[PDB]
Design a protein around this ligand. Structure first.
Ligand SMILES: C/C=C(/C)C(=O)O[C@H]1C(C)=C2[C@H]([C@@H]1OC(=O)CCCCCCC)[C@@](C)(OC(C)=O)C[C@H](OC(=O)CCC)[C@@]1(O)[C@H]2OC(=O)[C@@]1(C)O
Ligand SMILES: Nc1ncnc2c1ncn2[C@@H]1O[C@H](COP(=O)(O)OP(=O)(O)OP(=O)(O)O)[C@@H](O)[C@H]1O
Ligand SMILES: [Mg+2]
Ligand SMILES: [Mg+2]
Ligand code: NA
Length: 994
């Protein structure tokens, strides 16, 4: 029964055909279970470890590496010779990296937890029902409960299903529904039907929601829905149906893989076309097997050279490091890849209370009627000091301290504030500050009572724990609170029935003290109090009252106003029904207006500045608040969202106004709106949806399970540190301090992390371009391999990985927050930059291939065969050039490979320097700008020499320590790379402006 709240208890019992005193029969249970299923949320997919291991090899680049690992394996097996000392190193290294890759991938999944499974923490193991086959209640497993059975719940129980309350056994039933409605105060439940078929959860006063808790009382009810049909169940289905897209970088990275895969295959086809002349060679002669092995060798090297094997680790390291940095600033990032997205944040949707404001309530003004005489009318307005909950402060009349007691009107003002209140104060000796007990709104009144002290009590005698509730207790001894008519959103007011303390056999003296939203309370007043007298509510006085209220709540004070009143002659006690909250408003009529109190929930001290940073950064800010529209707008003007005098008619909406708009208008309203007040349960999700239809990267705040759907949908769900674990699990980031300013600071950090990432990504991919050219130039010239797989891998993971990481520490630009949000579609490399890396790549390719060919020719240490052209042959089956001798295996010498590798390492240490800045020369922005980068270069060179001298290594890498002359040749070919990029940058700065 989805609509149970609007049905009477008799109608719910008739619908299921069950009796309240016996419960369902076993046949009913059978059929109901069959029809509705078990009361539980579905189980998450049983992803097996094997399925998880197979996914670690779905990426296109890891599959290419796997393929090359296979070819490598085959080659290191179809080879002939005693090179058994080392041959399967290459394939074992590739495979090892792939294995290490998979392990990590599985490791993360095992430690990852999803929000959906976090909801199941809200379903109790057991529940209690009454079923026909037994006289007494029986506790069964919650999953065995079904729609229709009679359930029993009591204080401490976790509600097992969505239940329509049939009968409240205790004097009252109080529920803690915080997780679903946000109401952090336990609310009173009743049994009468709630007429509105579309009432939001907060107004279903006769329902118990599954996952919620009984704070007080005992009750009997009938199960309306179970499983995915409960409120929490529907939240679980929305979440499950929400698909979160890949981050911008993840998308570019996947696109890069596809293209790389395309380029690699094409290069293989090029190496084939450039050697089609081989078909013109005689069928006899030459080893077709040694020619094939050659091509498969460049295929393996080509694959290894094209893939930036160390990039993922570099990215993850920069992210982990930045994330730890962000934590120091109260931003707990849960998804490393979300740092980027945070930097792209285009719109920030933020709840007001507790995030934009402190949620520390304080009464600042208040007024009572002074005189009423015909058309003449005057009010008595006061001010109060002290923004804390501490009874420290004083009342003021024109900033001149006065005594409240000197005005009876204030004595009654304070009596209403003390009695029509469920809160109190408590001095926390530990912290040393007066903490609140209850809601902020009412506690502000409790605090106001202590400051007013209308009975001039001697509080300067009590301690710090007795000063708390001193003046309140005095007023409590003067009136006996019989019962209280709880507050409810419909009438927006609350009242308490009271009778004098010292009173004999009398039936006169009772009073109802009322507190609530001004408009409704003032409309129910037929009288106005003046000191101790009373006169009839007239238009002059009414407009006067409503005008000040409008001014206080809509002007620059942005005060939350409450009208206080008292029904002088309340109905007789026997004539009131305390169970029908629908009658509470009628009981609060024919009232006597006493006064108005205006309180402030001040903006965080940093919010003003942060909002301005957003404006500079081109980030739109949208406030979501529970305030009425007028006050919401007022507050937006106050903190900077709206200009003090700017028109906002179509930039601020209440939930109601928004719903009345057609879909097209709602979408349009979202592209310009900055303020949403009194927002429905699904509006956050609809707002996110509309924002995304404009490609906005949206950050949205939330804290309870009811915010989970929207948090999951927003590109950046932001949960409160003080919120539910579910909201946190559904968010990309958690504000350890709930402060809006913490979000802005994270966006900036995001912009800075990414800028540095852009550099080391371009740095690493740049080197792969050069490596591919080298492998291509060598395979197109029929030259002996200059660089082999194992070497390339060491350079891409270690040698270049260190500088790359260091680049992640590049100082941020000073105008980081003065620039608009970076467009998601923004490529990392294109235009003139694409050409530059096209030039640098061609350079590196020729420099390495050259350096090796150099040793093979114009080098003393090696065959000085200049212009001999290694291209000519590599089989020595004919031996035409070498007219006389006994050697031909110097084509496999380590010296030449060591010259190429040394050149690669040296040009890369230089290109890392050219990476500090995209367009600035090393003359404007020196290398020492980033000490980590210099330090890394020193560490990488040391590692290079390491594999050149420590015997085990040079054999594994096929390297041989270089001569001082050979080294100098390395510097001669490498160092000039700086000049090349220096010139390319110069052209970008001086001839590419527009
Ligand atoms: C890794 C090494 C190499 C050599 C590679 O093939 O990279 C290409 C490639 C896949 C792209 C290209 C490379 O293309 C070439 O260099 C042209 C072919 C030259 C081969 C000559 C042999 C006969 C990047 C590397 O070239 C330069 C010169 O910078 C730039 C960029 O990449 C990025 O912006 C990185 C995104 C994370 C991508 O065009 C990219 O494709 C895309 O979709 C992009 C948008 O991504
Ligand atoms: N305890 C209370 N007793 C009487 N009137 C109250 C009380 N709390 C709030 N009000 C009044 O009723 C109005 C509606 O309050 P309500 O709780 O629904 O909204 P809110 O507190 O401003 O935001 P939220 O929906 O997040 O709680 C308030 O603007 C105020 O005038
Ligand atoms: Mg409230
Ligand atoms: Mg919430
Ligand atoms: Na999200």
């Amino acid at each position: 029964m989805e609509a149970a709240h609007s049905k009477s208890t008799e109608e719910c019992l008739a619908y299921f055909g069950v009796s309240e005193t016996t419960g369902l029969t076993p046949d009913q249970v059978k059929r109901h279970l069959e029809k509705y299923g078990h009361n539980e949320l579905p189980a998450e997919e049983g992803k097996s470890l094997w399925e998880l291991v197979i996914e670690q090899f779905e990426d296109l680049l890891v599959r290419i590496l796997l393929l090359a690992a296979c070819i490598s394996f085959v080659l290191a097996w179809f080879e002939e010779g005693e090179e058994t000392i080392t041959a399967f190193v290459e394939p074992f290294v590739i495979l090892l990296i792939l294995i290490a890759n998979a392990i990590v991938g599985v490791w993360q999944e095992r430690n990852a937890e999803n929000a959906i499974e976090a909801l199941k923490e809200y379903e109790p193991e057991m529940g209690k029902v009454y079923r026909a086959d037994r006289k007494s209640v029986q506790r069964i497993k919650a999953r065995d409960i079904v729609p229709g059975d009679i359930v029993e719940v009591a204080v401490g129980d976790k509600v097992p299903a969505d239940i329509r309350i049939l009968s409240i056994k205790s004097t009252t039933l109080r529920v803690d529904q915080s997780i679903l409605t946000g109401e952090s105060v336990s609310v009173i439940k009743h049994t009468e039907p709630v007429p509105d078929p579309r009432a939001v959860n907060q107004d279903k006063k006769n329902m118990l929601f599954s996952g919620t808790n009984i704070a007080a009382g005992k009750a009997l009810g009938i199960v309306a829905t179970t499983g995915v049909s409960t409120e929490i169940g529907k939240i679980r289905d929305q979440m499950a149906a929400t698909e979160q897209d890949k981050t911008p970088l993840q998308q570019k990275l996947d696109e890069f893989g596809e293209q790389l895969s395309k380029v690699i295959s094409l290069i293989c086809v090029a190496v084939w076309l450039i050697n089609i002349g081989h078909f013109n060679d005689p069928v006899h002669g030459g080893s077709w097997i040694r020619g094939a092995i050659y091509y498969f060798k460049i295929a393996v090297a080509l694959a290894v050279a094209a893939i930036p094997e160390g990039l993922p680790a570099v990215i993850t390291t920069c992210l982990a490091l930045g994330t730890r940095r962000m934590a120091k600033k109260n931003a707990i990032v849960r998804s490393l890849p979300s740092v980027e997205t945070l930097g792209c944040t285009s719109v920030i949707c933020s709840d007001k209370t507790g995030t934009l404001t402190t949620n520390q309530m304080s009464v600042c003004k208040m007024f009572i009627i002074d005189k009423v005489d015909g058309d003449f009318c005057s009010l008595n307005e006061f001010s109060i000091t002290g923004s804390t909950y501490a009874p420290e402060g004083e009342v003021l009349k024109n900033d001149k301290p006065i005594r409240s007691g000197q005005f009876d009107g204030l004595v009654e003002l304070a009596t209403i504030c003390a009695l029509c209140n469920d809160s109190s104060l408590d001095f926390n000796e530990t912290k040393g500050v007066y903490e609140k007990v209850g809601e902020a709104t009412e506690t502000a009144l409790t605090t106001l009572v202590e400051k007013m002290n209308v009975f001039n009590t001697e509080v300067r005698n009590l301690s710090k724990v007795e000063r708390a509730n001193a003046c309140n207790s005095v007023i409590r001894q003067l009136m006996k609170k019989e019962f209280t008519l709880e507050f409810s959103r419909d009438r927006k007011s609350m009242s308490v029935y009271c009778s004098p303390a010292k009173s004999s056999r009398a039936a006169v003296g009772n009073k109802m003290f009322v507190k609530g939203a001004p408009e409704g309370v003032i409309d129910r007043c037929n009288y106005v109090r003046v000191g101790t007298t009373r006169v009839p509510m007239t238009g002059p006085v009414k407009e006067k009252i409503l005008s000040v209220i409008k001014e206080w709540g809509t002007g620059r004070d942005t005060l939350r106003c409450l009208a206080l009143a008292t029904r002088d002659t309340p109905p007789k006690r026997e004539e009131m029904v305390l169970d029908d909250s629908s009658r509470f408003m009628e009981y609060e009529t024919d009232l006597t207006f006493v006064g108005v109190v205006g309180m402030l929930d001040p903006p965080r001290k940093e919010v003003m500045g942060s909002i301005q940073l957003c404006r500079d950064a081109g980030i739109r800010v949208i406030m979501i608040t529970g305030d009425n529209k007028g006050t919401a707008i007022a507050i937006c003007r106050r903190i900077g969202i709206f200009g003090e005098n700017e028109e906002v008619a179509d930039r601020a909406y209440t939930g109601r106004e928004f719903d009345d708009l057609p879909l097209a208008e709602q979408r349009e309203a979202c592209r310009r709106a900055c303020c949403f007040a009194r927002v429905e349960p699904s509006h956050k999700s609809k707002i996110v949806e509309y924002l995304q239809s404009y490609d906005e990267i949206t950050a949205m705040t939330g804290d309870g399970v009811n915010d989970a759907p929207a948090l999951k949908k927003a590109e950046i769900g932001i949960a409160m540190g003080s919120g539910t674990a579910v909201a946190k699990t559904a968010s990309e980031m958690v504000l350890a301090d709930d402060n809006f300013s913490t979000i802005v600071a994270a966006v900036e950090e995001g912009r800075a992390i990414y800028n540095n990432m852009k550099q080391f990504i371009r740095y690493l991919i740049s080197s792969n371009v050069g490596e591919v050219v080298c492998i291509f130039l060598t395979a197109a010239l029929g030259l002996p391999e200059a660089l082999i797989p194992v070497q390339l891998l060491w350079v891409n993971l270690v040698t270049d990985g260190l500088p790359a990481t260091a680049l992640g520490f590049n100082p941020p630009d000073l105008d980081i927050m003065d620039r608009p949000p970076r467009s998601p579609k923004e490529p990392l490399i294109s235009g003139w930059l694409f050409f530059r890396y096209m030039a640098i790549g061609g350079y590196v390719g020729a420099a390495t291939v050259g350096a090796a060919a150099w040793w093979f020719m114009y080098a003393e240490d090696g065959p000085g065969v200049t212009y001999h052209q290694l291209t000519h042959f590599m089989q020595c089956t004919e031996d035409h050039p070498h007219f006389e001798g006994l050697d031909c295996e110097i084509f496999e010498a380590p010296e030449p490979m060591t010259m190429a590798l040394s050149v690669l390492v040296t040009i890369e240490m230089c290109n890392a320097l050219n990476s500090l800045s995209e367009n600035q020369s090393l003359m404007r922005m020196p290398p020492w700008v980033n000490i980590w980068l210099l330090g890394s270069i020193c560490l990488s060179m040391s590692l290079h020499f390491l594999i050149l001298y420590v015997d085990p290594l040079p054999m594994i890498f096929k390297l041989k320590a270089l001569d001082l002359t050979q080294w100098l040749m390395v510097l001669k070919i490498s160092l000039p790379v700086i000049g090349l990029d220096e010139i390319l940058k110069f052209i970008a700065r001086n001839y590419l402006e527009g």
